[PDB]
Design a binder for this molecule. Structure first.
Ligand SMILES: Cc1ncc(COP(=O)(O)O)c(CN)c1O
Ligand SMILES: Cc1ncc(COP(=O)(O)O)c(CN)c1O
Lengths: 396, 396
């Protein structure tokens, strides 16, 4: 049966790690990572998270299955985090949240629900986007189309091209929006541009799908949701796939949510029963540990206070590294203006390097970046900043 | 979109649960549960699991992503549990294991791998089987056909009718086998029958898919894989979906595995890359806590000794209840012969009640069982045994 199964290509983010590990050169730097890293080069367990795990160790009396949709307060809490504490969507019971294995899992559940219960045939993703986007929608049997987004010349959101590619793009098509900290560009719409897109979205009959993987990493917990919130005000229907992998450092516990909103309560319950039937035929019911940690933090005000500070420090570390990257570049002799880096948000940016400059830094120097020129600013430390910058000045 | 989504039909097993917590009238017995309960009626955390979780609290320094296929050690220990300590499959490197979200998640990733990389169009499951088998194979786009299994009259394995229905199965079809503790029947093949089914499988060209959700609950760890191991001896290729939800009490942490064996290592390496591509497009990589707990216990001889003892006592509790149920039925005055309960394995048996006898049992009060007649013997305690048997005698 398996004799003539072909190999499956190297994953563009994952494949680079092996290459790295296996290189065993001295002062090598990996900017191809997809995880926050602190000043010392590591990805620690948050203190709030370790305190909430001690609590669970002492209080759990059973590991009996969660409901198909998970922990209830996990769902109340992510609804307030996404839509704000007094949202009409919450008071009018127009939203339903299922706990899922990570943001990727929420995205696959949304895709299987849409494919099996709806007329959606196509989803529009930005060019560029996180490459596993195309694979979850394609696995569910959905066509993915690309809209323009980025200006390589100016390192900006070329809004006009985005709006023009989103023409025609039929009523009943899904448009996927990154809520904040665009991966791979770090270029986000302004609140005026989000409000325009929201208006255009209801004029055109699109179904907005927000991918929210990085809330809290651009400007703040509430600021980062204004885009979503501008759509949620004008739309009857909406889907949000969020992750708690980054803002809680819970990467391997698979903590995310898939939120469904419909015009009203009765319609969200009918549509959410089919979302649950899609979960049941995939993994049945969700991972409890990671999500229990999130519900314990978010609901205990001491713990939450400490988590918010831990998140603020992760956000400020990335902003320091963005200023220090372009300053050191100007100092070591960089030939080009790289100030756009300071404008961009979260852990990713396109460095503005050629595929051949990205192989030059791997081969010659210790520097590892994704072929696209995407670097992760959290991989830079005040310590490796000068050898990294000398190496890219050398390939400019 | 969503305006006219129809409600999903209530899940047979899970739908009874809410009717149960809505009754709240006094000495209600729920025998429709899918989990082990002890003499208290509780589903405890194993103390071996509490001990391994504290070790993880003290020793984890990161929650950074696992590989797509999960924890290594977890994979090796799963293969020795399944295939035995020195099996040629492990020494020839013919097997590859991916850590998965539960036994249901393993079934779904085997199903997407099979639907996307293979000529399989059908899977044969027994009649009866766990209701969710049809649904995960169907969500992957696979046809499920049914082979005969149970003898309603004699309460046995109708072997002649199973061989016969399986002659309709073509080469390149996957046949699904419950490894031990058949759900809902609890009727398992003898080793002589397993060996028959293996030989016949080799010459007719079936692809074996074993679902092993209860290893250790009928006889013992090794005794329970005896059937798997007869197929593994003569087959080039096979797939095993296993769960650690029941023998470890790790239900809501979603701990299972999917094992691929092929003719040789380079073939299973090429096919396993396609399996990992299917995982990546589903939930990206697996939940760490539960599998970390399984690998810690299995790795350490002290913890593994305590676990084996905890599994022994669960297995002996089910066996005592099977005995005490047919004895109490006898002395409470049952006019049917329930001897067959003693012969069956693990938590489930068909009681041999009609649809209208289980409805009246429930309404005329107390006892909740699946419409099918399926009873979970671990929901019976020495305390509720006589009123339960009272009510069953009352309806024959
Ligand atoms: C845009 C985007 N969406 C979804 C995800 C997935 O999140 P998770 O790690 O929980 O799968 C990522 C990766 N972190 C992402 O960058
Ligand atoms: C036969 C069978 N297979 C698979 C599963 C699923 O196991 P899990 O809960 O780990 O997904 C079950 C349910 N426990 C089952 O009874």
């Amino acid at each position: 049966m398996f004799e003539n199964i072909t190999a499956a290509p190297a994953d563009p983010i994952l494949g680079l790690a092996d290459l790295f590990r296996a290189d065993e050169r001295p002062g090598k730097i990996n900017l191809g990572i997809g995880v926050y890293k602190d000043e010392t080069g590591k990805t620690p367990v948050l203190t709030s998270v370790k305190k909430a795990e001690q609590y669970l160790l002492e209080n759990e009396t059973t590991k009996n299955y969660l409901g198909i949709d998970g922990i209830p307060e996990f769902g109340r809490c992510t609804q307030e985090l996404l839509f704000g504490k007094g949202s009409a969507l919450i008071n009018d019971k127009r939203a339903r949240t299922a706990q899922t294995p990570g943001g990727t899992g929420a995205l696959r559940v949304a895709a299987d629900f849409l494919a099996k219960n709806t007329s959606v045939k196509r989803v529009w993703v930005s060019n560029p986007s996180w490459p596993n986007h195309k694979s979850v929608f394609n696995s569910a049997g959905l066509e993915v189309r690309e809209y323009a987004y980025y200006d390589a010349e100016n390192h900006t959101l070329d809004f006009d091209a985005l709006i023009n590619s989103l023409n025609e793009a039929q009523a009943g098509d899904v448009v996927l929006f990154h809520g904040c900290c665009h991966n791979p560009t770090g270029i986000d719409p302004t609140l005026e541009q989000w409000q325009t897109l929201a208006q255009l979205s209801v004029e055109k009959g699109w179904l907005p799908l927000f991918d929210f993987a990085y809330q809290g990493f651009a400007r703040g917990l509430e600021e980062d949701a204004e885009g979503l919130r501008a759509f949620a005000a004008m739309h009857k229907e909406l889907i949000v796939a969020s992750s708690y992998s980054h803002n809680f450092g819970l990467y391997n516990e698979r903590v995310g949510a898939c939120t469904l909103v419909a015009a009203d309560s009765e319609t969200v319950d009918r549509a959410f029963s089919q979302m649950k039937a899609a979960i049941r035929a995939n993994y049945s019911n969700p991972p409890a540990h990671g999500a229990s940690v999130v519900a314990t933090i978010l609901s205990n005000d001491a713990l939450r206070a400490i988590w918010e500070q831990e998140l603020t420090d992760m956000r400020q570390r990335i902003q320091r590294m963005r200023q220090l990257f372009v300053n050191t570049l100007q100092e070591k002799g960089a030939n080009r203006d790289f100030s756009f880096i300071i404008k961009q948000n979260g852990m990713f940016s396109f460095s503005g390097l050629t595929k051949e400059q990205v192989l030059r830094l791997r081969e010659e120097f210790g520097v590892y970046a994704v072929a696209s020129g995407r670097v992760n600013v959290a991989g830079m430390t005040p310590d490796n900043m000068a050898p990294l910058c000398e190496a890219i000045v050398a390939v400019l």
